[PDB]
Subunit: 309 residues, 6 copies
């Protein structure tokens, strides 16, 4: 899917950039934002064409509140702000954001350059509220030391899971994406043995093999994020998580970013993680990870994004 905005199905990359911005309250601000995001193919190619491989991609997401400013009476079926959750000890806050740019490439300079051009074009019309420079960490691992992304659906399965279909024809090809910037307590996580960490996750650490059923805890990250409806049909999401961090401020992080054709799936996963199934049987990754943001965005298909205003 070379140099085309809204390519949700892109495979993992060595570098990413996650930018979340809040749009200004004016009509000028709205119009500038609308010009930039609807012409996003411009800077995408301005930057990406310079690398022969064409690895650069950019997915634009729009928040529920800003969507209603730019497209009042045409609205994807499930667009709403992020639903915050409050467990006894761990919570998923809902944090501001009208615009998401999820940028991936084989190199840092390409992500940075595109972000620079996007930010420059928006000028005073929007403000960056969250910025994360993701990087691949060894053999596709996160900073907890586990391979992160293994069971992502691919090919047809990825399209089926991520992309709006016949349920909502006016927005076919779009998606819904949720982000959360997690920070880890590395000290506390290191007090665990490998075997305990594997029980927390649901897979072996080095070898990345799923624990067998008889050894798989009911509150493992894997068990809690396995979604099968009443009819026995599995429901998956597409994740593009990346490590990030700052050694001086002791930030070791995982940027969660998951796409679904219906955010009810992602939301159910989150509520299973934070609230438990059975109730109180929550995801122990959360003992070692604290979400600092939580925002949902609608990802319009190319055709819809280009029509805005």
């Amino acid at each position: 899917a070379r140099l085309a905005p809204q390519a949700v199905l892109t495979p993992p990359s060595a570098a990413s950039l996650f930018l979340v911005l809040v749009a200004g309250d004016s009509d000028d601000d709205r119009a500038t934002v609308c010009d930039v995001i609807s012409g996003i193919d411009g800077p995408l190619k301005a930057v990406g064409f310079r690398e022969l491989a064409g690895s650069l991609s950019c997915v634009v997401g729009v928040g529920a509140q800003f969507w209603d400013r730019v497209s009042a009476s045409s609205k994807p079926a499930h667009l709403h702000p992020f639903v915050p959750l409050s467990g006894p000890v761990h919570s998923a806050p809902s944090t501001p954001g009208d615009l998401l740019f999820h940028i991936k490439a084989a190199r840092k300079d390409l992500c940075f350059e595109l972000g620079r051009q996007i930010v420059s074009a928006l000028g005073s019309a929007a403000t960056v509220v969250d910025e994360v420079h993701g990087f691949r960490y060894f053999d596709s691992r996160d900073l907890l030391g586990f391979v992160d992304g293994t069971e992502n659906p691919t090919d047809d399965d990825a399209a089926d899971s991520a992309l709006i279909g016949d349920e909502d024809p006016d927005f076919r090809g779009g998606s819904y994406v949720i982000v959360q910037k997690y920070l880890h307590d590395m000290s506390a996580w290191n007090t665990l043995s490998t075997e305990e960490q594997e029980r927390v996750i649901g897979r072996t650490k080095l070898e990345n093999v799923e624990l067998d059923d008889d050894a798989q805890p009911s509150n493992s990250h894997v068990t809690l994020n396995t979604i099968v409806d009443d009819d026995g049909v599995e429901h998956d999401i597409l994740r593009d998580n990346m490590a990030f961090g700052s050694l001086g401020e002791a930030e070791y992080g995982t940027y969660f970013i998951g796409y679904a054709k219906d955010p009810a799936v992602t939301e159910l996963m989150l509520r299973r993680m934070f609230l438990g199934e059975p109730p109180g049987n929550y995801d122990r990754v959360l003992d070692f990870s604290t979400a600092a943001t939580g925002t949902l965005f609608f990802v319009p298909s190319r055709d819809v994004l280009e029509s805005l205003g």
Copy 2:
């Protein structure tokens, strides 16, 4: 297609693992085997996701007999055990195999790791009967020194040639695969001149150009493996041949592996090779290569495989 099992249409790779196994007669065995293969996506991703490029692939083949132990009520139009051939000079054996794992990656370690995890999860339920570690040799050559795989169908031609279509709709997306582990007589091949070797194969050696029509022997490997029907229509297979060997055992091999939507095509090629066309006019490649195995498998589509 990234990290999806039963991806028959994958381009050539630097490394291969060909694993042929036989299943236990037991019923725990039938079940374990069934669990490992119907969930093969699991180990594929467990290993393959660790490589940024996601080059790892795995095609699972099921022998006719073991297919009957596991899906009795439904069977693909052309599933049967490998038809042995007994020709004038040369013979193709029919050797045992219930399960085929055709593994490819950019790296050896990925092939080995995936194999290791497949074998470990099968435990005592099945036994490795043939293991081949294939490798790319220079510019896509076999150990006979010819570029090997040149005329393979690609893209749409490849799908049409290898993948079960409207003609057997319950098994669309599947394929039939035949393997044969060939061992070469390197001394004997080396006593031929380049030009004689070219006559045997059907193409120039260094340049990999197909001989002119007037200079093309009627028993050249290329002529014998060219299939045209009565309407004038060509029928092709998709080969993923790799070299392999052991210097201490003086083994120098080409691992043959061919996919077709209908094994009749591959079987006819084998027939023209081993029996000759006209009869006795056989493939001289056979004078320097001996098939140590010979096994046919059904390659179920990913949907069919995941039900079991």
Copy 3:
């Protein structure tokens, strides 16, 4: 795509070869040529399969006069010879060509070797009339110093821009290609400031960013090559331009090659460049670039090419 002839939508490559040829007068010449181009998949795979990555591609174009010698039976709707243009300052000549081979690969040797096999196979039946060895120059730049190709359509847009569809169903999958070999006056170009060069092209030089609507001159290259119909729909072409040159001859060039499902789009860009829009307001790029060739070809789909 992989090693398939007529792959119009291939992404940019490190190297390419542009070969333009005129065919001989005899019916023999016309048969040899038809034989070569209709079997072009042979040499394509013979060379291309030798590279693991399979980057080698080859698009064959056929000029209008030659097409009539071979298929007076049926014609693509827009096939005609290249139309010369005579502007107030610059002219685009129409120069001979019956056949185009547009060859791309990750490596020069692959392009060269494919060209070698093609030319050898054609022998006396054809003569090379123009030959250009294109190369990538830094971060996708032309020798004028500007990123060249930025706004090419990609993916579905590329197919909708370049590939013949419902409008001419007999030749669906084909395309039309125009080539022009441009030589630059480098010393003249360098007398301009970067800002002046930016106003000539329509984008900033290092950063490759389109000039704002109100800083875009009406005769900028970008402005003149923007084609918008009465219904507000933009019409794009697919360009595969490469740098070339010779330091001893002081030749510094850009080889233009542009594919479109309807060549009138490309032709209209050419007219607006050479004659200006409004008339007189011509493309200042032409003050530093002189086209030495100008030829139109029909690019038959694989099916149509293989039946010629």
Copy 4:
């Protein structure tokens, strides 16, 4: 070199990490720090060996005050704290730093992971006072758009420029390094024409060609940073500058890091830049760049570091 600490002469990399730290007051803090830096080869290999290519490097610098806490016994001839400069328009501050870790690799994860291990191992004994994640920007450019590093000495010239020799034999193989973290005023920079920017730097922008002697302004960055002794001998430094920034903070930076066997060379460049040569005639780069840090370190050879 391969996975050896204090490899000053490594070529440029895709990624780097600049960590500046202040050590604690206690003798315990001074012992932990000495333990970590003297054993720095451990973490270097622990991380670095994991990459086949072995690109990971780590140069440890020690500030003058900290060096006295650890080796009041003997001092390198030119070790002193960074000298602040107060020019007519711009100033270079002297900011704290006892330790520098200058880490380079082909990959960000390697730099990050080495930094992680270093910081963890130091625990409470030290505090990170400045941290910069450098990255390569297109074809070796800084964020000002100019190729940055062109005239670095290489090979023998690099060793003669950067490495302590006969002049201070007790510390042979060591070096002296100055870091300054510069932030740019990008909107101001963009108001200049390319030609104006070229006159500020001393080279053409896209093509990276030194301006002719008679078009080179006397206050160009290149002119001011050319150091020629009375005997006509040029004295060069070794720079490993990288881009960095944060789009949300509008931070666009160049991290300066310059190695020399005698830091007076580097210091003299700094004085000529900030104060001008002649006085008043200062470097116009400083009109668009503000140094937020300024620190001098001694870079001990492996031997000396390993005995600390």
Copy 5:
């Protein structure tokens, strides 16, 4: 060092071939062997030059006994057959070998081809006794899942550790190499917890960090293989260990290969491993790994090798 035999100091590679041969008792044999190895540069270049990067290398080892058949009047200070070890629980055999070919490249095909040409040129004059195809496993790990080779000496440390110096001047540039083909008990190793495995090795598993001094078992592989003399001086070897295996035979191996300027260092390591220090306190790696071979060779400098 490119395409030069006896390049002991080469960095790790993606692929290896370890070939151990015994020579014929005959005198034609002595001579043929002598011709093949003294001219080993020939085949090395014949194969290696075909790869642009020139990654192929070949170290030739000569057993003590065969060295006496071929260079009677001159012998290196420490050449002798491999000293077998018979410990409390575990034993290291002394297996036969006259010739060692330690081959490394970026690719398998280059290793195999070189091996093929070496074996072919030796003909009946010598017989392959052990053949191992080594491969890189993930991020420089052995099949026990630990990063393997981390603490290897590099650059000058590596030359000082592995290469014969002023202390045996007739053989400067040479080395002594010991091989041992280890096979692992994967089931048994898998019943240990990660933490127990870490205690056995001496380093953390995923992170490859060396255990703290207070947590470092006295029988950990690292402790046992740490050699410090009476003056306080450490002595190291250069290891080029690779993984290898066969899934059907359930073989999972680490091929040990260690180079030293003096085999006493390596022999002491082996002694501390197998016998323990204090006695009985042996290396628990040995509880999960069994040495199937054990052979010592002299690695002549390229000058010494080419005279024979």
Copy 6:
């Protein structure tokens, strides 16, 4: 040897550029040429630094006649114009050239860009008389289809063979290089069988193995270019040959370029090839290859090159 002019010992590359120029007769011309070549490190780094790998190299050679214009009374011991040879059917002509630029890199654009900058700086002061764009052809082969360069010395052996030592201390580190642009008769060469081609060369075609002694013809390319003096000491040269060609003008070529500390070795090789040993027993490669140029150049060390004028 990163981005340093006169790096004679560089390993093979994917692309090369061979430029031969004749200097103008004036004093201005001489001075401009002298400025350009003595400052050659300038454009070398201006171009080469832009590629992270630093693969770009440039070796400057100076002809005997031009050397005497720029360095009248300091002269390397063996600098003379190319010695032409005249066999009964094949000849090695001596053709003009005062300057050689032998440029190598991993990419074409880098070779071309450096050549452009060099040519631009020389302006009217010199004229290109020969220009060849070399490329790697498959697995290090020439257009005859044989691996070409196999037995080149490497490392210490390469330094010993190519570079002036104690014999001529004032020019230590310099070298002497000879070029000849060969064109092949591809038709005639294809009428030979592989086995005959192997006898012409002295090695097997595909596998690149030296023919054994008992099968190695006395007029094979290998035999004729094997140089052993009376004392039994072998003398080698360092070659950087590359393919080149033009399909339209039916040019299929090999650019010969060989470096030696003493051109007597290269010259002896050439006379063995063209004249035979025994006499008339000439190199049969020459039945299929015709030299269109022949020029010798002195390659000054960096220090000597930078001192010129």
